[PDB]
Amino acid sequence: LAKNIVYVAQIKGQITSYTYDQFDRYITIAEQDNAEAIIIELDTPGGRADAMMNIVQRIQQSKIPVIIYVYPPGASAASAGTYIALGSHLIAMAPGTSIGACRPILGYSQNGSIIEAPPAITNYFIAYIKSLAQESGRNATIAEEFITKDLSLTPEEALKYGVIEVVARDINELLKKSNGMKTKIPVNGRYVTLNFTNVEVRYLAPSFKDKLISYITDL
Amino acid sequence: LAKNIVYVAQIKGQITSYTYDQFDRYITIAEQDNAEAIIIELDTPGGRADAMMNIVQRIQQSKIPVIIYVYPPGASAASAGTYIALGSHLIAMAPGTSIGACRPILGYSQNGSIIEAPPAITNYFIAYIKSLAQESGRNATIAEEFITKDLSLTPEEALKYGVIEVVARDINELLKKSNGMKTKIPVNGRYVTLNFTNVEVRYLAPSFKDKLISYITDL
Amino acid sequence: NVIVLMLP
Ligand SMILES: [Cl-]
């Protein structure tokens, strides 16, 4: 039991009910193993509000820090993924990645045309995103604009505007740079200082089910 | 005199985008074969709002009557499924089936919890369900209560209250009772009289993709 | 583009 463990997992594609299950499974593994943290490499272009809210909640109740890492280069945490990022203990972005564009919608027509929701539901998600940002000490002005302006930011813009905490090219740089940082939200009632000196990195493989279901959603 | 072709298809589980694809596929086949009607045996606990609205729209554009049949016994057209019924040319229910229970929620949470829908979403769905009822000469008063009271009805109740047109034990009894009925919404701008004298019934198989997706669901 | 809703 005299080890320091960081888990790394991968989450890719639409945020659905199934994505909740993955988040729950990986975070649960890390908790049961008393990990110092879990890093989630996140690449998601969109998803559902309900699954997103359930994931933020599961991260809020996590017994270990959850670091959302927008990875690999070219990844995005757009739409539902931005809320997940904003709801977490720390956000890192890889070079060539994107955060933002969070406008809520009722979905897509037969055309593939955009079905915007009523004005008051936009206001509801503005409130929600402002809440997540203020609870984690992040820029709620820019967060609001993720919705009202469909604003999208590069990693360096995200850092300068005080939306994320780290820009890192890989897991190793991420660990080096986030070492000694405080979580932006508590872990079990307490803001925690990340201890990543002498850490063992453990990669959690996506299962066959994860890949199959992701690939089917994909199309 | 003329032999009238009627297609029968089964649609089961949660209303999603795959469900839209099923409705689209089954209705197209029937339109191309110049069918008198397509009956859809529907059993759904609910689902997604956008896919539901896409399905209602597909049914409005249908060049043939679409009959929603809540079947087999034990089935329901709850939540999104009720809007589909209300948006169709005729509704039938088997004994022991259910319709209604349409109070929108943002979704289900972790531990039996539910995420409440803001009043705007609720009012928006009240307007929409009342409109579908009015357009199809169905009880708009009762349809609102599907939402405001999470009201759910038996087949006998649904008929009595002017929500559905037919209570039938199988395809046989359905065709016999609905023969001579006018569709509740138009088919290409005319309210059609159903001719179920001299009928050939054809059952439509679900495709590979249908079977795969739902078998992943059963697990 | 978060998609919002469903019913129960
Ligand atoms: Cl600490």
mmCIF file of N, CA, C and O in Angstrom, chain B residues 114-172:
data_model
loop_
_atom_site.group_PDB
_atom_site.id
_atom_site.type_symbol
_atom_site.label_atom_id
_atom_site.label_comp_id
_atom_site.label_asym_id
_atom_site.label_seq_id
_atom_site.Cartn_x
_atom_site.Cartn_y
_atom_site.Cartn_z
ATOM 1 N N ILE B 114 -34.248 12.223 -10.034
ATOM 2 C CA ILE B 114 -34.554 12.712 -11.386
ATOM 3 C C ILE B 114 -34.165 14.191 -11.522
ATOM 4 O O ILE B 114 -34.205 14.951 -10.540
ATOM 5 N N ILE B 115 -33.756 14.580 -12.728
ATOM 6 C CA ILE B 115 -33.405 15.968 -13.001
ATOM 7 C C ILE B 115 -34.652 16.672 -13.529
ATOM 8 O O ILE B 115 -35.189 16.294 -14.563
ATOM 9 N N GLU B 116 -35.102 17.685 -12.795
ATOM 10 C CA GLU B 116 -36.334 18.402 -13.103
ATOM 11 C C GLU B 116 -36.209 19.239 -14.370
ATOM 12 O O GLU B 116 -35.194 19.901 -14.589
ATOM 13 N N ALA B 117 -37.249 19.208 -15.196
ATOM 14 C CA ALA B 117 -37.319 20.071 -16.364
ATOM 15 C C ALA B 117 -37.777 21.456 -15.942
ATOM 16 O O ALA B 117 -38.719 21.586 -15.141
ATOM 17 N N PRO B 118 -37.112 22.506 -16.467
ATOM 18 C CA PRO B 118 -37.528 23.876 -16.159
ATOM 19 C C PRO B 118 -38.916 24.159 -16.743
ATOM 20 O O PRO B 118 -39.270 23.572 -17.774
ATOM 21 N N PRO B 119 -39.699 25.051 -16.094
ATOM 22 C CA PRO B 119 -41.074 25.335 -16.536
ATOM 23 C C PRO B 119 -41.218 25.590 -18.050
ATOM 24 O O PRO B 119 -42.235 25.199 -18.642
ATOM 25 N N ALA B 120 -40.204 26.212 -18.662
ATOM 26 C CA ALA B 120 -40.223 26.543 -20.092
ATOM 27 C C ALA B 120 -40.347 25.304 -20.979
ATOM 28 O O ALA B 120 -41.214 25.255 -21.846
ATOM 29 N N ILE B 121 -39.483 24.315 -20.753
ATOM 30 C CA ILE B 121 -39.591 23.004 -21.396
ATOM 31 C C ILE B 121 -40.960 22.351 -21.185
ATOM 32 O O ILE B 121 -41.535 21.781 -22.107
ATOM 33 N N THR B 122 -41.476 22.439 -19.971
ATOM 34 C CA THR B 122 -42.781 21.876 -19.645
ATOM 35 C C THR B 122 -43.878 22.562 -20.465
ATOM 36 O O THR B 122 -44.641 21.888 -21.159
ATOM 37 N N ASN B 123 -43.920 23.896 -20.412
ATOM 38 C CA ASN B 123 -44.882 24.689 -21.187
ATOM 39 C C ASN B 123 -44.744 24.432 -22.681
ATOM 40 O O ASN B 123 -45.739 24.333 -23.392
ATOM 41 N N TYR B 124 -43.506 24.322 -23.147
ATOM 42 C CA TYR B 124 -43.243 24.029 -24.546
ATOM 43 C C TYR B 124 -43.878 22.686 -24.954
ATOM 44 O O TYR B 124 -44.485 22.587 -26.029
ATOM 45 N N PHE B 125 -43.757 21.668 -24.095
ATOM 46 C CA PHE B 125 -44.354 20.368 -24.416
ATOM 47 C C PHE B 125 -45.851 20.303 -24.231
ATOM 48 O O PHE B 125 -46.512 19.577 -24.962
ATOM 49 N N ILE B 126 -46.383 21.086 -23.290
ATOM 50 C CA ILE B 126 -47.832 21.254 -23.172
ATOM 51 C C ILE B 126 -48.378 21.819 -24.478
ATOM 52 O O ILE B 126 -49.320 21.263 -25.017
ATOM 53 N N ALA B 127 -47.786 22.905 -24.987
ATOM 54 C CA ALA B 127 -48.225 23.508 -26.264
ATOM 55 C C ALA B 127 -48.166 22.493 -27.413
ATOM 56 O O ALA B 127 -49.138 22.324 -28.149
ATOM 57 N N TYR B 128 -47.044 21.792 -27.531
ATOM 58 C CA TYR B 128 -46.847 20.796 -28.600
ATOM 59 C C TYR B 128 -47.842 19.599 -28.523
ATOM 60 O O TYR B 128 -48.430 19.183 -29.542
ATOM 61 N N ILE B 129 -48.045 19.052 -27.328
ATOM 62 C CA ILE B 129 -48.938 17.893 -27.209
ATOM 63 C C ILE B 129 -50.403 18.310 -27.450
ATOM 64 O O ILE B 129 -51.157 17.562 -28.073
ATOM 65 N N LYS B 130 -50.781 19.496 -26.942
ATOM 66 C CA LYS B 130 -52.107 20.068 -27.199
ATOM 67 C C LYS B 130 -52.295 20.306 -28.678
ATOM 68 O O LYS B 130 -53.334 19.983 -29.226
ATOM 69 N N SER B 131 -51.283 20.863 -29.335
ATOM 70 C CA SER B 131 -51.349 21.056 -30.790
ATOM 71 C C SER B 131 -51.524 19.748 -31.600
ATOM 72 O O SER B 131 -52.341 19.704 -32.530
ATOM 73 N N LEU B 132 -50.757 18.704 -31.273
ATOM 74 C CA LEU B 132 -50.919 17.393 -31.924
ATOM 75 C C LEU B 132 -52.335 16.838 -31.704
ATOM 76 O O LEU B 132 -52.930 16.294 -32.618
ATOM 77 N N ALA B 133 -52.849 16.948 -30.477
ATOM 78 C CA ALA B 133 -54.219 16.546 -30.183
ATOM 79 C C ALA B 133 -55.257 17.361 -31.004
ATOM 80 O O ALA B 133 -56.099 16.795 -31.680
ATOM 81 N N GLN B 134 -55.155 18.682 -30.972
ATOM 82 C CA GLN B 134 -56.065 19.540 -31.748
ATOM 83 C C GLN B 134 -56.016 19.211 -33.243
ATOM 84 O O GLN B 134 -57.060 18.988 -33.853
ATOM 85 N N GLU B 135 -54.810 19.125 -33.812
ATOM 86 C CA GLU B 135 -54.655 18.840 -35.247
ATOM 87 C C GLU B 135 -55.296 17.526 -35.641
ATOM 88 O O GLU B 135 -55.724 17.379 -36.764
ATOM 89 N N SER B 136 -55.342 16.562 -34.730
ATOM 90 C CA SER B 136 -55.848 15.251 -35.079
ATOM 91 C C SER B 136 -57.239 14.982 -34.483
ATOM 92 O O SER B 136 -57.670 13.832 -34.422
ATOM 93 N N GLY B 137 -57.924 16.046 -34.053
ATOM 94 C CA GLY B 137 -59.240 15.946 -33.399
ATOM 95 C C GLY B 137 -59.289 15.052 -32.169
ATOM 96 O O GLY B 137 -60.288 14.358 -31.928
ATOM 97 N N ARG B 138 -58.213 15.051 -31.384
ATOM 98 C CA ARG B 138 -58.155 14.228 -30.192
ATOM 99 C C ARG B 138 -58.238 15.096 -28.950
ATOM 100 O O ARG B 138 -58.026 16.310 -29.026
ATOM 101 N N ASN B 139 -58.511 14.475 -27.806
ATOM 102 C CA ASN B 139 -58.778 15.227 -26.568
ATOM 103 C C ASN B 139 -57.564 15.993 -26.027
ATOM 104 O O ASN B 139 -56.677 15.408 -25.380
ATOM 105 N N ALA B 140 -57.545 17.296 -26.286
ATOM 106 C CA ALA B 140 -56.425 18.156 -25.921
ATOM 107 C C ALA B 140 -56.390 18.413 -24.426
ATOM 108 O O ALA B 140 -55.317 18.616 -23.838
ATOM 109 N N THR B 141 -57.566 18.412 -23.821
ATOM 110 C CA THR B 141 -57.697 18.565 -22.391
ATOM 111 C C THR B 141 -56.972 17.432 -21.668
ATOM 112 O O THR B 141 -56.124 17.685 -20.812
ATOM 113 N N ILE B 142 -57.324 16.195 -22.016
ATOM 114 C CA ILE B 142 -56.677 14.992 -21.492
ATOM 115 C C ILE B 142 -55.189 14.869 -21.871
ATOM 116 O O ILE B 142 -54.378 14.407 -21.064
ATOM 117 N N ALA B 143 -54.825 15.281 -23.088
ATOM 118 C CA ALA B 143 -53.425 15.213 -23.508
ATOM 119 C C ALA B 143 -52.535 16.106 -22.660
ATOM 120 O O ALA B 143 -51.415 15.726 -22.337
ATOM 121 N N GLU B 144 -53.031 17.286 -22.290
ATOM 122 C CA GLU B 144 -52.292 18.174 -21.390
ATOM 123 C C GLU B 144 -52.019 17.447 -20.071
ATOM 124 O O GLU B 144 -50.921 17.558 -19.503
ATOM 125 N N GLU B 145 -53.015 16.700 -19.601
ATOM 126 C CA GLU B 145 -52.892 15.983 -18.322
ATOM 127 C C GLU B 145 -51.890 14.826 -18.373
ATOM 128 O O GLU B 145 -51.326 14.447 -17.329
ATOM 129 N N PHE B 146 -51.673 14.262 -19.568
ATOM 130 C CA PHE B 146 -50.545 13.333 -19.755
ATOM 131 C C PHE B 146 -49.274 13.982 -19.194
ATOM 132 O O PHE B 146 -48.399 13.284 -18.696
ATOM 133 N N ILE B 147 -49.187 15.312 -19.287
ATOM 134 C CA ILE B 147 -48.052 16.066 -18.766
ATOM 135 C C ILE B 147 -48.288 16.584 -17.342
ATOM 136 O O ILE B 147 -47.522 16.278 -16.438
ATOM 137 N N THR B 148 -49.342 17.363 -17.140
ATOM 138 C CA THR B 148 -49.516 18.078 -15.873
ATOM 139 C C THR B 148 -49.843 17.157 -14.687
ATOM 140 O O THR B 148 -49.677 17.538 -13.537
ATOM 141 N N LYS B 149 -50.294 15.945 -14.974
ATOM 142 C CA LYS B 149 -50.672 15.017 -13.920
ATOM 143 C C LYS B 149 -49.984 13.665 -14.088
ATOM 144 O O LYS B 149 -50.265 12.735 -13.346
ATOM 145 N N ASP B 150 -49.067 13.582 -15.053
ATOM 146 C CA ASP B 150 -48.420 12.322 -15.471
ATOM 147 C C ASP B 150 -49.489 11.249 -15.670
ATOM 148 O O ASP B 150 -49.299 10.082 -15.315
ATOM 149 N N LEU B 151 -50.619 11.672 -16.238
ATOM 150 C CA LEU B 151 -51.758 10.802 -16.468
ATOM 151 C C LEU B 151 -51.448 9.732 -17.497
ATOM 152 O O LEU B 151 -50.908 9.998 -18.578
ATOM 153 N N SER B 152 -51.794 8.511 -17.138
ATOM 154 C CA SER B 152 -51.651 7.375 -18.014
ATOM 155 C C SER B 152 -53.008 6.671 -18.105
ATOM 156 O O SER B 152 -53.686 6.544 -17.102
ATOM 157 N N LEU B 153 -53.383 6.196 -19.289
ATOM 158 C CA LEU B 153 -54.710 5.615 -19.514
ATOM 159 C C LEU B 153 -54.682 4.185 -20.033
ATOM 160 O O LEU B 153 -53.791 3.813 -20.803
ATOM 161 N N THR B 154 -55.680 3.397 -19.624
ATOM 162 C CA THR B 154 -55.943 2.088 -20.227
ATOM 163 C C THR B 154 -56.563 2.300 -21.625
ATOM 164 O O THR B 154 -56.994 3.398 -21.943
ATOM 165 N N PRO B 155 -56.600 1.242 -22.459
ATOM 166 C CA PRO B 155 -57.205 1.350 -23.798
ATOM 167 C C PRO B 155 -58.665 1.830 -23.740
ATOM 168 O O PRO B 155 -59.038 2.740 -24.475
ATOM 169 N N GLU B 156 -59.463 1.218 -22.861
ATOM 170 C CA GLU B 156 -60.884 1.549 -22.682
ATOM 171 C C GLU B 156 -61.056 3.006 -22.250
ATOM 172 O O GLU B 156 -61.935 3.704 -22.740
ATOM 173 N N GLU B 157 -60.223 3.450 -21.320
ATOM 174 C CA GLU B 157 -60.220 4.838 -20.900
ATOM 175 C C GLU B 157 -59.843 5.770 -22.060
ATOM 176 O O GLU B 157 -60.470 6.799 -22.246
ATOM 177 N N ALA B 158 -58.832 5.377 -22.835
ATOM 178 C CA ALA B 158 -58.287 6.203 -23.910
ATOM 179 C C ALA B 158 -59.337 6.425 -24.997
ATOM 180 O O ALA B 158 -59.465 7.534 -25.531
ATOM 181 N N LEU B 159 -60.089 5.369 -25.292
ATOM 182 C CA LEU B 159 -61.170 5.442 -26.263
ATOM 183 C C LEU B 159 -62.287 6.343 -25.753
ATOM 184 O O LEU B 159 -62.710 7.278 -26.436
ATOM 185 N N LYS B 160 -62.740 6.059 -24.537
ATOM 186 C CA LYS B 160 -63.811 6.800 -23.902
ATOM 187 C C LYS B 160 -63.506 8.303 -23.879
ATOM 188 O O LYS B 160 -64.389 9.105 -24.171
ATOM 189 N N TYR B 161 -62.258 8.662 -23.553
ATOM 190 C CA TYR B 161 -61.821 10.061 -23.469
ATOM 191 C C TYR B 161 -61.471 10.742 -24.798
ATOM 192 O O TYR B 161 -61.122 11.927 -24.816
ATOM 193 N N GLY B 162 -61.557 9.996 -25.894
ATOM 194 C CA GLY B 162 -61.374 10.569 -27.219
ATOM 195 C C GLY B 162 -59.922 10.852 -27.551
ATOM 196 O O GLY B 162 -59.605 11.871 -28.175
ATOM 197 N N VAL B 163 -59.055 9.935 -27.138
ATOM 198 C CA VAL B 163 -57.626 10.022 -27.396
ATOM 199 C C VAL B 163 -57.193 9.063 -28.508
ATOM 200 O O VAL B 163 -56.243 9.347 -29.236
ATOM 201 N N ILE B 164 -57.857 7.917 -28.595
ATOM 202 C CA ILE B 164 -57.539 6.867 -29.569
ATOM 203 C C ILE B 164 -58.813 6.479 -30.323
ATOM 204 O O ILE B 164 -59.908 6.892 -29.959
ATOM 205 N N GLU B 165 -58.675 5.718 -31.392
ATOM 206 C CA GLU B 165 -59.835 5.422 -32.216
ATOM 207 C C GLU B 165 -60.283 3.971 -32.075
ATOM 208 O O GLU B 165 -61.458 3.670 -32.310
ATOM 209 N N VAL B 166 -59.356 3.089 -31.690
ATOM 210 C CA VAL B 166 -59.589 1.645 -31.723
ATOM 211 C C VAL B 166 -58.962 0.825 -30.565
ATOM 212 O O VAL B 166 -57.781 0.999 -30.220
ATOM 213 N N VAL B 167 -59.753 -0.091 -30.008
ATOM 214 C CA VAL B 167 -59.252 -1.114 -29.099
ATOM 215 C C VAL B 167 -59.373 -2.473 -29.818
ATOM 216 O O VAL B 167 -60.472 -2.879 -30.195
ATOM 217 N N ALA B 168 -58.246 -3.159 -30.010
ATOM 218 C CA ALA B 168 -58.199 -4.387 -30.811
ATOM 219 C C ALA B 168 -57.173 -5.420 -30.297
ATOM 220 O O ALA B 168 -56.051 -5.049 -29.949
ATOM 221 N N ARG B 169 -57.553 -6.701 -30.286
ATOM 222 C CA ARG B 169 -56.724 -7.782 -29.704
ATOM 223 C C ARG B 169 -55.591 -8.265 -30.600
ATOM 224 O O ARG B 169 -54.591 -8.785 -30.106
ATOM 225 N N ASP B 170 -55.771 -8.130 -31.912
ATOM 226 C CA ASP B 170 -54.750 -8.505 -32.895
ATOM 227 C C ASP B 170 -54.980 -7.776 -34.224
ATOM 228 O O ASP B 170 -55.937 -7.010 -34.361
ATOM 229 N N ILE B 171 -54.092 -7.995 -35.190
ATOM 230 C CA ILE B 171 -54.191 -7.339 -36.492
ATOM 231 C C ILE B 171 -55.582 -7.540 -37.094
ATOM 232 O O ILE B 171 -56.192 -6.584 -37.601
ATOM 233 N N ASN B 172 -56.081 -8.776 -37.006
ATOM 234 C CA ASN B 172 -57.406 -9.138 -37.515
ATOM 235 C C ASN B 172 -58.489 -8.208 -37.021
ATOM 236 O O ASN B 172 -59.201 -7.609 -37.824
#
